[PDB]
Each structure stands twice: as structure tokens, then as C-alpha cells.
């Protein structure tokens, strides 16, 4: 239904370092998909916000304790989370996807992964997927303990490709990396805006109504495209 | 109760950057209180571990979907977490505390904060705590949006003190920062080792047994003191 504010300002908790969703620019101001998108949603609906960029764990606990009204933080919607949060309509799909070098034209479909070296960060959803499909597609998996070493290996040619959460890859491309995403991604759920279960229902109404308007009026795509290599 | 391992190795998920609990040293190896403490606990009990420093949110989701066995990640024990995780005995009491300059003799207690300005990061427990006691002791709160600027402000004298997580302040001091902690810390919960609720009970047993042995044998304090002094 139509959303009416019941607070002069709503407090939103978020991560302090989760690019491209929320991160600091060179001027030390917070920015990102979540920041621009929720700000644009509130503005569309005539709500006011105050952001607390405190970290994922801290943001969860702040909403649960009533010290924040909502959480916008690259948050994967899960059944475990639904036990204690209510979510707005999902605002972005999460995918696991393959990054190649943009200079390498040899990988055009999944069948071209035959004989390739694929990187993944140890213990991640990308790692689990790659391990589970290595025999089928015929690649070999090389594991990394952190993100920097993995992306360095793709750039120096010691892996042919890697799998990661798609926003990380598409943001690196937007930043200037010579990567591409030439093949089909693997759906892996959705991102959601959350309030404590049973709390601030009008803030969820705001969210859903504002989001629908931004999807229809083009601003939603403009915001995503600012941060993620768009296909268009 | 005796803990017996049922796997040759258990997988532990943790955050990639939460110093001094889990973080990378200059050699890009993962280290910290959580890493050293759970490794030592595991060793004490004859269990083997493999660590995946995937990030807090990702670690939660991995344990919940059965793709990591446990989580050791500066994890505050809360009722909401008890909905979906089982915990070992708490292994650390996380407090908030005040940092002043080590050369500033003027602040030794809360009442010495009269007329002073203290920093806190917006929307944190420290921010809430300072705001709640500002009228009582007659200080002003200056809000910061990131740690680096807040700590720089203390160092350059544009604030008189700050409040932050005690381990962050104590680790900074251990690293040579010229801060003091003149005021009694404020309790802010406890950290626990987690498994998915109903899973891996022998891993919780071994955590509890090992933690108790390390408290008794001196290693627990050695590990904490390594980082916090
Ligand atoms: Cl976090
Ligand atoms: Cl959580
Ligand atoms: Cl409307
Ligand atoms: Cl969570
Ligand atoms: Mg993080
Ligand atoms: Mg994930």
C-alpha cells in the first residue's frame, strides 16, 4: 500500500566495506549501489534517511536491538535471515559467474572451459560450484586464500578464468580491469532490504513502492549501471 | 565429556578482515586472536582444521548450508544467532573503552571529561554509550564516519579522546600507538565459536574442553596477550 512515514528520519545500518554495494570513494565519502539506490528510493517516496556504515555483523545486531530501523548491506536473502527479518521485494539478483581476460577470445560457452585453469577463493559458494562441476566441464580448480591473489593470477595469466560473486567482477570491470563475463551465470539468490521482523512495516512499503517507481522510471538501471558493467 | 573427531579435518569459516581477531600480516598470511586460539584449542584436543576467510556474511551462509563446519569470527552471541547456531562456552568478553593520548595527563576518569570532546564512529555501541552519558559528565560527542579519521583526530589533538572496541584500541597500543586507556571498560557482550544448530556436536565439545585446558595451562592468556599486551 501507499507508504506514509512515521519517523522524521529512518536510521539505516550497513557494511563499511563491501564494494560495489557500499564503500568509500577517494574523498572518503560513502557511495555504492545500496547507498544510491536506497537514497533514491527514500527521495522518491518522501522519506528521510540517516546511514550508519558500521559493518555487516554490527548492522544485523543494530537492527535486531532497535538501534537501527533498516539494513541495506548487500544482504543475501536466506530462510535463516527470514526467521528474524522482514524483507522488501528483492532489489538485485546474486549470481556466481565466470570472469575471463577481455583479451582472451577462446571462452564463449561453458563447453570451452575444457582444459582450462579456473580460480576460486577457498570455501566460497563459487569454489563449491566449481568443484561440483569440474568433471562435467573438464576444467581444473586452483584455490586462493584471498581475493587479491586470485585477481592477480587472472591478470598475470596463471589462471585462465575465475568464479566469484558477479557484482565483484562487474565492478572491477567498471573500475578499469580487462575482464569479461562471456558465459552463462549461475543464479544464487537475491539481495534484500531488511527490517526487524514485525517492525517498521511502512518502511518496507516505502521500499517496495519506491523501488517499483525507480524500475519504471529508469533510475534503477542508471544506478546499477554506474557501478556494474552493463550488458545493454 | 571426551571429544572425538569424526572427520580428518573440519572446515572453519571466518571474516577476511577483523583485526585483531582475524586478519592478514604483511606476509599475507592469516593470523589473529581467533586463528591462534582455535588452532591451539584444536591442537589440544587432537582435531585438525582448515580455515576459509570468506567474510562474516558468507561464513554464516556457508555454515548454515552445511559447507563449513564451524565459524570463529569475533561473533557476538545473541538470541537471534541462537536461533540457528549452537555455541561453545564464550571465549572472550568484548568491551568498549576510552582511548586518550598517552601524554595527556588531564583525563584519568569520566569526571575529567568535563568540557572535552570525544570521538565515536556513527551508529556504534560506543557512539550510543557516549551520547547516553554526555549530559552526566559534561562532554561533547564528535561523530566520525571512519576509523582512520577518528584516530588521526586523536593523534592531532582535534579531539581529546575517543571510544571504540577495546581490542582495537589495545592492539593499536601494542603496535606502538601513543594511546592510553585510563577508564574502566564497558561490557559489550561475549564472543562465541559456532556450529549450525544440531550439527557437529563433537566440535563444540572439543572447543569447550580445549578452551578450559588452555585457560588452566596458560596458553589462553599467552594468545590474548600476544595481540593486546
Ligand atoms: Cl562484519
Ligand atoms: Cl548473523
Ligand atoms: Cl508512490
Ligand atoms: Cl546473518
Ligand atoms: Mg567485511
Ligand atoms: Mg553468498
Automatic annotation (TrEMBL), chain A:
It is found in: Cell membrane. L-glutamine binds at residues 15, 73-74, 76, 81, 125, 165. It comes from the Bacteria. Belongs to the bacterial solute-binding protein 3 family. This is Glutamine ABC transporter permease and substrate binding protein protein. It comes from Lactococcus lactis subsp. lactis (strain IL1403). The gene is glnP. The chain holds residues 255 to 484 of 714 of the full protein.
From TrEMBL, chain B:
L-glutamine binds at residues 15, 73-74, 76, 81, 125, 165. This is Glutamine ABC transporter permease and substrate binding protein protein. It comes from the Bacteria. It is found in: Cell membrane. Belongs to the bacterial solute-binding protein 3 family. Belongs to the binding-protein-dependent transport system permease family.
Amino acid at each position: 500500500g501507499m507508504a506514509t512515514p512515521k519517523k522524521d528520519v529512518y536510521t539505516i545500518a550497513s557494511d563499511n566495506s563491501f564494494a560495489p554495494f557500499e564503500f568509500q570513494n577517494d574523498d572518503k565519502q560513502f557511495t555504492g549501489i545500496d547507498v544510491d539506490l536506497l537514497n533514491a528510493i527514500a527521495k522518491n517516496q518522501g522519506f528521510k534517511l540517516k546511514w550508519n556504515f558500521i559493518g555487516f555483523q554490527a548492522a544485523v545486531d543494530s537492527v535486531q536491538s532497535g538501534h537501527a530501523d533498516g539494513m541495506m548491506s548487500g544482504m543475501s536473502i536466506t530462510d535463516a535471515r527470514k526467521q528474524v527479518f522482514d524483507y522488501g521485494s528483492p532489489y538485485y539478483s546474486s549470481n556466481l559467474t565466470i570472469a575471463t581476460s577481455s583479451t582472451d577470445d577462446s571462452i564463449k560457452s561453458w563447453k570451452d572451459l575444457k582444459g582450462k585453469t579456473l580460480g576460486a577463493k577457498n570455501g566460497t559458494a563459487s569454489f563449491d560450484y566449481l568443484n561440483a562441476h569440474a568433471k562435467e566441464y573438464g576444467y581444473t580448480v586452483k584455490t586462493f586464500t584471498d581475493a587479491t591473489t586470485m585477481y592477480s593470477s587472472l591478470n598475470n595469466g596463471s589462471i585462465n578464468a575465475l568464479m566469484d560473486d558477479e557484482p565483484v567482477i562487474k565492478y572491477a570491470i567498471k573500475q578499469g580491469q580487462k575482464f569479461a563475463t562471456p558465459i552463462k551465470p549461475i543464479p544464487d539468490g537475491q539481495y534484500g532490504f531488511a527490517v526487524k521482523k514485525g517492525s517498521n512495516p511502512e518502511l518496507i512499503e516505502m521500499f517496495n513502492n519506491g523501488l517499483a517507481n525507480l524500475r519504471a522510471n529508469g533510475e534503477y538501471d542508471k544506478i546499477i549501471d554506474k557501478y556494474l558493467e552493463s550488458d545493454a
